[PDB]
Structure 1
């Protein structure tokens, strides 16, 4: 959907569409063809757990992407709020993340940058996975803490290709963060030390989860952050074990 600036009244702003209401907007003639098709690739990913690109503004000197407004922000923001989020809601968040990831991998899409900033939350505490850094979109990205969720095989090795297992690693650390209510690795001394430590087997401190976290989720996070990518499960594999666990115990 090719939108115009005049339908509303870089940087992120909250915007009011004249016919369609409240959205979030992030703001060279040769690149316009490629940018449009690249946005058409973003729009083909349609699922309840995946954010929707509602459209794009290609004007002279303004290039913007417009997505749906997710009222409660990112996942870390919800987790760090004073109103605590009960075990049943955390479990459902996990299930929904699994569903969103299973959908993306089923379409041959590797996220590459799964992290709590990229898990957006609506007013009823439902989630959608997003690619807010534009990891999957070269031209739009070109036209424009961060490493805690990254699989060790990508740390100090920028040339190796991401796989589905890269996202499984990220998921693992998201699970830890969901129960810890914070970023991991608070007691690290420096980033290069940390990176090397992580590459050698260091992982978030399981004992730093104070609240009740069921044994199954702790087992799951450990399996999903295994050093060998081939030892990590797939998202279909995770869904089939986690769904019945969620239904019996958490729902």
Structure 2
């Protein structure tokens, strides 16, 4: 069940519009700050309970304040971790890839298409374990009513009519795979938003040759399959896991 929280249960906040908040009992939490259906959508999102998914612990529904309260991941997002001293060994990277696949397969099993999967939505703890988050509320309908295109499937670029599918998340994952090995955002040479959109829609993808740090040939083949222009040519997350998991256990531990 979802917990109705009061802003009096918090001692102070600091904007990391997300914010770190200190609860007087449950400790550290993240706070992101139609009255009736808002709490039912909170109950629905509170059902997303998995080890690789940031849990919605509670909601603040007060006169003037409407906030979503989530579990805190002490290291921040994936990109910030990757750029902070690029020591991150290959076996840890492979483990992060496997955890992302597991979280995405869980979400799709609950009928949830993310739509905004990117390193900014992959949060990290002190042991380098990850959880998928939806900080921009891409998967919300009521709560959302009250460099980002790098991870967007070409079918949605310049086409808002296109219904997002489970294959839209597979494409985002493919670009996340490239970013994990490159330790940076793709398309550094792109000059304009319009040219980048048209280049991607015409077949352009992140530079596979721009990975100075070693990346196994099998992972490069996987990202090339996941970022295929035809959504139907992309594999599903359990299909990715069925090939990645045995590679991870026999080559990366």
| TM-score class normalised by the smaller sequence | over 0.9
| 1:5-47 CA distance string (max 9 Å, x none) | 11111x33221212211111111xxx11111011111101100
Runs of 4+ residues over 2 Å off in structure 1: none
Match of 2:195, SS state, is: helix
What is the count of residue pairs matched by the alignment? 246
The 8 Å contact of residues 86 and 183 in structure 2, kept in 1 or not, is answered as: no
| 1:45-69 CA distance string (max 9 Å, x none) | 1000000011000000000111111
| 1:81-102 CA distance string (max 9 Å, x none) | 0252111110000000000001
Match of 1:147, SS state, is: coil
Equivalence for 2:103: 100
| More helix, by proportion | 1
Shift in alpha-carbon separation, 1:14–1:208, aligned structure 2, 3 A: same
Give the structure-1-normalised TM-score: 0.96
Structure 1 residue runs without a partner (length 5+): none
CA distance in 1, matches of 2:170, 2:155: 13
Match of 2:174, SS state, is: helix
Match of 2:143, SS state, is: helix
CA distance in 1, matches of 2:48, 2:216: 33
| 1:99-120 CA distance string (max 9 Å, x none) | 0001011111110010000000
Match of 1:140, SS state, is: coil
Give the structure-2-normalised TM-score: 0.96
CA drift at 1:77: 0.2
Structure 2 residue runs without a partner (length 5+): 12-16
Aligned counterpart in structure 2 of residue 125 of structure 1, from 105, 125, 128: 128
RMSD: 0.8
CA distance in 2, matches of 1:110, 1:147: 17
